[PDB]
């Protein structure tokens, strides 16, 4: 029906139009006869009848009289639903101001009338007069006055000038203004004189003004004159049932304001003294303010318990507001709640269900089936029958359940898998059984976690469940292709124990004719479950085109492995079942099985895996005993030695030979060494303890100690826990982060003494508190994240572009942190790659890089690839399929319609809980050395000294693919040149990390040019040694005498003329800065590359929070704003000044630099844009504006993925790239051209992108935009749809602005569609929604 929503102001006329009467009495209810009052706050004649088709006086009480009114009550005989839709109005004796439009921050009234808010508040609160016109006299349009000022002004100038005080005066001012005329005047004024801050102020004011005329709103409407009132039913008066009623504070606010209004009415009738009416008007204004929004004034109001009342402005804000409480999340019928148990006998696609809950839920279906069977020819008898659950009803239930899925949910549902469909199976219990494998997906322990049950009613819901949410359809995490049904902890133990081998077990060396014989032998007990035996088997290899070629062989394995092989499906290599089968092995096995034989074989194989694992784990009887905690024998000796070692250091400090801090550090170091030794010793003594005769004399093997089996298998616990159990549990850190010198030397097999346990308790409490706060914050983070990227849906197939990004394997100075093969897996190419047979088209330019092509790349050792990203897709209000890539939830390209944004947000947000809250180059491989960004010279020793900063060293292998990479520090000596051969362990470079030299380039004399002792330099000759030394002073250190001169040293020669820079015609002179200590002399030879002088020198979840929020850093390492030569200007005006000058372009750009910044460059250097001028963090906004988009996005993804992988969590880059695309969704105009956009306008990037695009089809020139980046919390607010923002936080701010703008929402986003409850244009509903869109 309706399509759009419109919002604007309301004139008092319109308010009356809505109204169905006027309220006049603050009385509500008689408390003796519970009918309402005559025309009180509740009333029938105004609102409507209380009972359906019932006159209040009951003169007529039947539907026959529908339409008529009573003559005793004037009440309309009709339904009582009218009592939920009728609105009354209140005639306010005096004008009053609307609180929102006053303290909006910015205040629309304030800046509109252009008065400081303080003055306005003074006027409105009856403490300062203000002239309306004040013409024909000394006064101006809107001069203010105090009280004495006002009386004096009227005394001296008792002429017609008028100065009022309050809402009436404000209303007169507003209504007495011409908008468009002021608009013209203000635009002319802002034309120039002056764009310093008046630029911003005038632009904003003109924006508001042109907005006003653009809407059909009149400014004076901000001043309330008639007050609407809510329908009575929406503020119902619930009885407390003790003969009294509840509070219902809204009604108290209403009665209070009514009392003020009537009191003022009386006083005005009586023409009381002006002081009294002024006080009462102030009181009424305050009451109105409280009603609209209590608390924004300096003092809220409370009835009892000192708790502020609930204003209308409170019914919307916060979690309890309607949006987030009843309008976005709701309670729902047809639901259940219970505890959960395992019941491992279930299939993966079904779950247990109690009889009682099942019977309760499906009651309507039961009624329908009973009536169809005819056993109950009514609903009441049927209800009776089900109420007493005759035996028949149970088979009916079984019939109804036959193929009806249901939904299971766990409370903290982070990611998509947190809720899933299942088929039900009835059970005579009261606990929901649950197939154990899904527990990992639900992250659901059985320590008493509860689950909730829902049922899909309509047919389409059932089909959606079966075809999308069935458990068997969700096996790969969307975050990454990794499976998500890993045999978690017990089955894995069983399997690992199965696929082991004792050196000499019962029934060894014999031969078998197939796994069935192995099973029979083991069941008869004639052989141990794991002993080496040769057995014949048959592999099935489908290398042919979908043709399973069988091939037999006689392998040699252990009986347990052979028995296990019976389960695996046809097409797999037997080698996959020939190892110890750790957890990783099982996961990889499942992954490969799915990748080869599709879906169904994989799931059935998993079920059999689980069954067998449980059976044989139970058979194993692997228990834990105290004897298993084997303490290493040498531990005591090691500890004693370490203690004796500590003693000598303590002695050395006693004599004072050593300081305290070094004592502390060495103590810690030796303690760590001893602890490591103990750990290693116990681990060795444990893992290989088993020594067994082999039927020869003796041997050894891996151990069967239950603890080690559990640990190595990966079922539970890393090495750290077992170390604590057996070995000393290391050092503990005290609250402030310090580490206690004395470690805990006791393990848990032994008992800790008091103090040790005390310290450990401290640590554990720290951990627990951190966990609590971490989850608390992570919830908020993810809530923010999803809000900003909920509108994005793939809606196209191909946008038809060629831009992309060069995906390359990540290097961190060290090895490959992640090979290229996994960064590009499953993303279409932009431009075809050419093999290193260059001119060899290896792949097409628009093919999907599935596994085989990745293998092709790997065997061809490709370095970097142009891949189509999502940040550049040319689709408007969406993204074409190719720009995205594969689904990553199933092996094929993404479908058309998917809501990728939401799943990406969920994938990013879910893992947050696991995070934490609070010299020389030594190459190590033989290969070719290569160097990039090389601006270097040869020094006196023949080695190579660099003079560029971003110089980078690569070690490439013989084939030619890069293998290692390292950052070259500035001014580092290098043994080699470029393109040499290095040996493993060959130190290739060295440098000083401490001080900064004044390295030169060429040999010759050095002359102290423009250096006079007294005002430029000081003769601070070294006294310890006696060599010549003179120090150039800083600006502050130098006296005023030598400020104008610029000390420098120009390379000279014997003849005395200046030497020339190599290559360029400019003369060579190093400008010595302040505090330039020079030990050289005048006219003295120095060789190439020599220091002429010397000058001295978080990662937690909040890191991600800030980075996505795009908050600026503490110390922003300034960058090269543009290219060109650098120079200085007026100095020490609190800071230095710098000016850049292009070779030819203009050069108005200068900057003011804090004195603390150690600029590495000098004025004599021409520098290109982007180059670091200071050192430290970097601001993304400048990165964008100076290096386009592909730079900022790459930086962001690198940073975030670094943080994530540091903790060991796998996430695909697409989910981040989509976020970035949303982040940078805006733009700002630089030049309209033939467009129609004002200059400073910030406009949606899409609108301009299509406007210019179509204008060029005409002979018109578009505009010149410039993209922009915003924190998510800002971008989510600067969205076309205002409802989406309103459901988000700070409803008042967005809503007031939108109402003033008179915005008009069209509802094509998701969240809003949810609000109004219609099919989402995302999933299945996408087809219908697009179809309906096409219908118009």
């Amino acid at each position: 029906e309706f399509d759009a929503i419109k919002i604007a102001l309301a004139s008092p006329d319109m308010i009356r139009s809505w109204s169905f009467g006027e309220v006049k009495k603050p009385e509500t209810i008689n408390y003796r006869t519970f009918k309402p009052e005559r025309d009180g706050l509740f009333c029938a004649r105004i609102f409507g009848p209380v009972k359906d088709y019932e006159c209040l006086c009951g003169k007529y009480k039947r539907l026959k009289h529908r339409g008529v009114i009573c003559e005793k009550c004037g009440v309309e005989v009709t339904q009582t639903k009218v009592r939920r839709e009728r609105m009354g109005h209140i005639e306010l004796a005096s004008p009053t101001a609307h609180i929102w439009f006053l303290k909006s921050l910015p205040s629309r009234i304030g800046l509109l009338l252009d008065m400081p808010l303080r003055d306005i508040e003074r006027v409105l609160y009856f403490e300062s007069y203000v002239v309306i016109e004040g013409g024909m006299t000394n006064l101006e349009r809107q001069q203010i006055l105090t009280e004495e000022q006002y009386l004096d002004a009227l005394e001296e100038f008792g002429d017609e000038f008028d100065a009022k005080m309050g809402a009436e005066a404000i209303q007169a001012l507003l209504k007495s203004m011409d908008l468009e005329q002021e608009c013209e005047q203000l635009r002319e004024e802002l034309n120039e004189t002056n764009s310093e801050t008046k630029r911003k102020k005038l632009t904003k004011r003109i924006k508001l003004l042109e907005a006003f005329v653009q809407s059909g709103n009149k400014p004076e409407w901000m001043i309330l004159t008639v007050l609407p009132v809510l329908p009575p039913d929406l503020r119902p008066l619930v009885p407390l049932d003790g003969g009294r009623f509840a509070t219902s504070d809204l009604n108290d606010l209403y009665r209070r304001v009514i009392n003020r209004n009537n009191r003022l009415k009386r006083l005005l009738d009586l023409a009381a003294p002006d002081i009294i009416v002024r006080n009462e008007k102030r009181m009424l204004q305050e009451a109105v303010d409280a009603l609209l929004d209590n608390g924004r004034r300096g003092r809220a109001i409370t009835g009892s318990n000192k708790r502020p009342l609930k204003s209308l402005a409170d019914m919307i804000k916060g979690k309890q507001g309607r949006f987030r409480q009843n309008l976005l999340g709701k309670r729902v019928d047809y639901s259940g709640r219970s505890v959960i148990t395992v019941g491992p006998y279930l299939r993966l696609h079904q779950c247990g269900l109690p009889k009682k809950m099942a019977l309760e839920l499906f009651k309507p279906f039961i009624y329908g089936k009973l009536e169809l069977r005819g056993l109950a020819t009514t609903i009441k008898a049927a209800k009776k029958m089900v109420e007493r659950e005759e035996a028949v009803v149970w088979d009916i239930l079984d019939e109804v359940i036959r193929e009806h899925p249901v939904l299971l949910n766990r409370a903290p549902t982070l990611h998509r898998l947190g809720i899933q469909a299942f088929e039900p199976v009835l059970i005579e219990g009261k606990a929901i059984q649950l197939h154990p494998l899904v527990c990992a997906a639900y992250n659901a322990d059985f320590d008493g976690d509860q689950m909730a049950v829902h049922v899909p009613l309509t047919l389409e819901a059932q089909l959606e469940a079966r075809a999308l949410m069935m458990s068997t359809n969700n096996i790969l995490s969307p975050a990454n292709g990794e499976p998500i049904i890993v045999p978690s902890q017990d089955v894995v133990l069983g399997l690992y124990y199965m696929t082991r081998d004792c050196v000499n077990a019962k029934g060894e060396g014999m031969v078998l004719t197939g796994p069935k014989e192995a099973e029979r032998l083991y069941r008869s007990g004639l052989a141990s479950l794991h002993a080496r035996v040769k057995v014949r088997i048959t592999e099935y290899e489908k290398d042919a085109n979908g043709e399973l070629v069988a091939k037999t062989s006689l392998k040699d394995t252990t009986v347990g492995r052979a028995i296990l092989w019976m389960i695996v499906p046809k097409g797999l290599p037997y080698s996959i079942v020939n190892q110890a089968l750790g957890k990783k092995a099982i996961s990889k096995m499942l992954n490969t099985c799915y990748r080869i034989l599709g879906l169904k074989p994989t799931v059935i194989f998993a079920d059999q895996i689980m069954y067998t694992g449980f059976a044989y784990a139970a058979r194993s009887g692997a228990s834990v005993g105290i004897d298993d905690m084997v303490i290493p024998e040498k531990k005591h000796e090691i500890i004693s030695e370490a203690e004796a070692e500590v003693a000598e250091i303590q002695e050395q400090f006693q004599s004072g030979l050593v300081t305290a801090g070094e004592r502390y550090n060495k103590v810690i170091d030796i303690w760590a060494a001893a602890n490591d030794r103990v750990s290693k010793a116990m681990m060795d003594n444990l893992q290989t303890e088993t020594v067994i005769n082999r039927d020869g004399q003796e041997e050894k093997q891996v151990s069967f100690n239950s603890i080690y089996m559990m640990a190595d298998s990966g079922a539970r616990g890393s090495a750290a826990q077992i170390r604590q159990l057996a070995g000393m549990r290391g050092l503990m850190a005290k609250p402030d982060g310090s580490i206690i010198e004395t470690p805990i030397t006791a393990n848990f097999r032994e008992g800790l003494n008091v103090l040790q346990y005390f310290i450990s308790t401290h640590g554990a409490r720290k951990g627990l508190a951190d966990t609590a706060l971490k989850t608390a914050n992570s919830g908020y983070l993810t809530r923010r994240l999803v809000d900003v990227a909920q509108d994005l849906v793939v809606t196209e197939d191909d946008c038809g572009t060629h831009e992309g990004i060069m995906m390359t394997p990540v290097i961190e100075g060290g090895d490959v942190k992640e090979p290229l093969r996994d960064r590009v897996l499953g993303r279409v190419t932009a431009e075809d790659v050419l093999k290193p047979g260059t001119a060899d088209i290896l792949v097409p330019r628009n093919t999907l890089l599935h596994e085989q092509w990745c293998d092709l790349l790997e065997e061809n050792s490709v370095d970097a690839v142009k891949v189509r990203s999502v940040v550049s897709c040319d689709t408007d209000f969406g993204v074409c399929a190719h720009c995205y890539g594969r689904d990553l939830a199933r092996g094929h390209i993404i479908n058309k319609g998917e809501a990728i944004g939401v799943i990406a947000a969920q994938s990013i947000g879910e893992p947050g809980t696991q995070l934490t809250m609070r010299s020389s180059i030594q190459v190590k491989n033989k290969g070719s050395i290569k160097l990039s960004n090389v601006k270097s010279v040869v020094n006196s020793s023949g080695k190579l000294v660099i003079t560029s900063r971003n110089t980078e060293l690569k070690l490439i292998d013989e084939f030619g693919r890069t293998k290692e990479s390292y950052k070259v520090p500035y001014g580092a000596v290098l043994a080699k040149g470029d393109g040499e051969q290095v040996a493993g362990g060959e130190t290739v470079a060295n440098w000083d990390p401490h001080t900064m030299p004044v390295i030169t380039e060429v040999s010759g004399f050095v002359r102290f040019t423009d250096m006079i002792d007294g005002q430029t330099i000081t003769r601070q000759t070294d006294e310890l040694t006696g060599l010549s030394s003179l120090v150039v002073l800083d600006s502050a250190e130098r006296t005023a005498g030598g400020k104008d001169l610029r000390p420098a040293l120009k390379i000279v020669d014997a003849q005395g003329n200046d030497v020339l820079i190599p290559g360029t015609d400019m003369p060579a002179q190093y400008f010595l800065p302040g505090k330039a200590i020079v030990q050289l002399e005048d006219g003295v030879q120095i060789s190439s590359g020599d220091t002429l002088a010397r000058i001295p020198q978080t990662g937690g979840l909040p890191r991600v929070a800030d980075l996505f929020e795009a908050r600026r850093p503490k110390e922003p390492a300034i960058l090269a704003e543009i290219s060109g030569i650098v120079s200085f200007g007026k100095e020490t005006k609190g800071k230095r000044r710098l000016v850049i000058t292009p070779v030819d372009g203009s050069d108005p750009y200068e900057e003011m630099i804090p004195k603390w910044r150690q600029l590495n460059v000098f004025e004599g250097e021409r520098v290109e844009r982007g180059d670091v001028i200071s050192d430290g963090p970097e601001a993304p906004h400048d990165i964008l504006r100076l290096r386009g988009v592909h730079a900022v996005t790459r930086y962001i993804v690198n940073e975030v993925q670094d943080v994530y992988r540091l903790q060991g969590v796998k996430i695909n880059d697409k989910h981040i790239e989509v976020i970035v695309r949303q982040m940078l969704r805006k733009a700002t105009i630089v030049n309209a051209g033939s467009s129609d956009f004002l200059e400073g306008e910030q406009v949606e990037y899409s609108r301009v992108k299509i406007a210019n695009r179509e204008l060029e089809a005409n002979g018109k020139v578009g505009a010149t935009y410039s993209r922009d980046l915003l924190g998510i919390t800002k971008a989510s607010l600067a969205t076309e749809s205002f409802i989406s923002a309103a459901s988000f936080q700070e409803t008042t701010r967005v809503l007031t602005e939108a109402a003033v703008a008179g915005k008009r929402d069209e509802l094509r986003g998701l969240k809003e569609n949810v609000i109004v409850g219609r099919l989402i244009p995302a999933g299945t509903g996408y087809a219908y929604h697009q179809d309906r869109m096409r219908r118009r």
Partner: protein, 79 residues
Amino acid sequence: ARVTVQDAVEKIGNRFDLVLVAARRARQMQVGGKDPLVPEENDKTTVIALREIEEGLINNQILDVRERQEQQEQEAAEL
């Protein structure tokens, strides 16, 4: 019994329109007085429609053809 939908998705490689076409068929079957094309085994209508989709004898195109044909028959049945 029905445990997977992989074959149906193979017949219709989108996984969304599958739901809609199956729903329309099952709606014809349940409230509309129609009959199945596969021998049912005491199974509900949704699974039956899904199996029909699986065997490929019913897809969106054939459904459009059938609805148009029966519409023409009804328009020819009024006389």
